[PDB]
From a paper:
The mycobacterial repressor, DarR, a TetR family regulator (TFR), was the first transcription regulator shown to bind c-di-AMP. Recently, DarR, a 201 residue, TFR regulator of a putative MDR transporter, Ms5347, in Mycobacteria was discovered and represents the focus of this work. Structures of TFR proteins reveal that they share a two-domain architecture with an N-terminal DNA-binding domain and a C-terminal inducer binding/dimerization domain. The DarR N-terminal domain consists of helices 1-3 and the dimer domain is comprised of helices α4-α9. In DarR, dimerization is mediated by helices α8 and α9, which interact with α8´ and α9´ (where the prime indicates the other subunit in the dimer) to form a four-helix bundle dimerization module.
To elucidate the structural mechanism of c-di-AMP binding we obtained the Rhodococcus sp. USK13 DarR-c-di-AMP structure to 2.45 Å resolution. The structure revealed no density for c-di-AMP in the inducer binding pocket, but density for a di-adenine nucleotide was observed near the four-helix bundle module of DarR, with the nucleotide making contacts to both subunits of the dimer. The density for the adenine moieties was well resolved while the density for the phosphate groups was less clear. Hence, a di-adenine nucleotide was fitted to the map. In the structure, the dinucleotide is wedged within the long loop between helices α8 and α9 of one DarR subunit and also contacts residues from the N-terminus of α8´ from the other subunit. In this interaction, only one of the adenine bases is bound within each pocket and the other adenine base is solvent exposed. Each of the exposed adenine bases inserts into the binding pocket of an adjacent DarR dimer, leading to DarR polymer contacts in the crystal. In addition to Gln184 and Arg179 both adenine moieties are contacted by the side chains of Trp177, Tyr178, Ile181 and Leu192 from one DarR subunit and Asp159 Leu162 and Arg165 from the other subunit. As noted, the density for the phosphates are weak and indeed, there are no phosphate contacts from DarR.
Residue numbers in the entry:
A (entry chain C), B (entry chain A): 10 to 207
Write the structure that this text describes.
């Protein structure tokens, strides 16, 4: 509900000014409320970080998991999973940064165990997500619709390639859903299809 | 000669701790020297970061540029350039981090003309490095060794994929130069040839 509004503006502020130099007041300014309502909804600043991670990891999974069991060859579901994964990134950049800057928070010596208890639990959520891609890649290797490559290395490589889109992608003012979807499909075409000729 | 020892130490400390959480103190401990030694060869912590960036650009360009004019189709030279880039990434991991940590020292206080001038200067070195790959990609497309894709999108996609090896790759001690070369060849096979079959 109205936490969703806080999670977005928190993720975006987390992405722009950094977790370290963003404060609960800064989210209060962005969300247009007082320091009260934020602290009503999450325990602490690190709780919003955890919540954006958790929510953003749920967003990408509800969008990608439906294709794991769908019909089609392995390559065909992998393509659909990837376009979804890239499209999630370009639409929800703030969530994507907090998810993959959960190490930027790890850069400071891991302080609270009862927090590194939830952050590690969250890491397992990202682990499970990547397992979906490993499963389809394995299936696509066996059904011939992918190359006989190393299943582990191809999974690491592909997922890092999908998350690397944020290196050069910017939110263009006025890009439509269709345009973003099409650009994600262009990107996935180079990732799955390669750039060399055959 | 000996400055290189401080550059090695700052690159790795900037990688693990992060730029902000490393001080001139730790670099001195890490080289086995006093703070005064570092303040000899560099005015400021940022100027070290500047020197690590500059040495990171020189190392990778020296390793990769020879393959630009080597014999081969555009694909063959793109492959050779890319392996050397990834080899340099795996071998000089701290330097690579700093060369692309730059995004984190751009969002921070862009403050001094004497320094921000030099930081933007390094980004043109980087931009000019990334133009070497763009030019080879354009040739590879024109000579049929690469699929007829968007040469600008493929350049951004490829370079970000090559630089994303650092998501999952860790220096494993005892790993030889040959093993790094083999692993980098494996990665580049996937970036150039895709995972898709047929």
């Amino acid at each position: 509900d109205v936490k969703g509004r806080i999670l977005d503006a928190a993720a975006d502020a987390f992405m722009l000014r950094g977790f370290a130099n963003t404060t609960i007041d800064d989210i209060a300014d962005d969300v247009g409320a007082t320091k009260g309502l934020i602290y009503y909804h999450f325990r602490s600043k690190f709780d919003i970080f955890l919540a954006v991670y958790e929510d953003g990891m749920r967003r990408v999974r509800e969008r990608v998991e439906p294709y794991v069991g769908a019909p089609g060859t392995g390559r065909q579901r992998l393509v659909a999973m990837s376009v979804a994964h890239v499209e999630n990134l370009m639409i929800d950049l703030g969530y994507h940064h907090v998810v993959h800057q959960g190490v930027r928070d790890q850069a400071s010596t891991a302080l609270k165990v009862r927090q590194r208890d939830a952050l590690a639990a969250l890491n397992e959520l990202r682990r499970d997500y990547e397992r979906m891609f490993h499963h389809v890649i394995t299936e696509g290797i066996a059904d011939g619709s992918l190359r006989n490559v190393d299943d582990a290395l191809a999974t690491r490589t592909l997922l890092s390639n999908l998350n690397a889109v944020d290196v050069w992608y910017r939110k263009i003012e006025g890009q439509t859903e269709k345009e973003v979807h099409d650009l994600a499909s262009q990107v996935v075409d180079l990732l799955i299809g390669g750039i060399g000729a055959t």
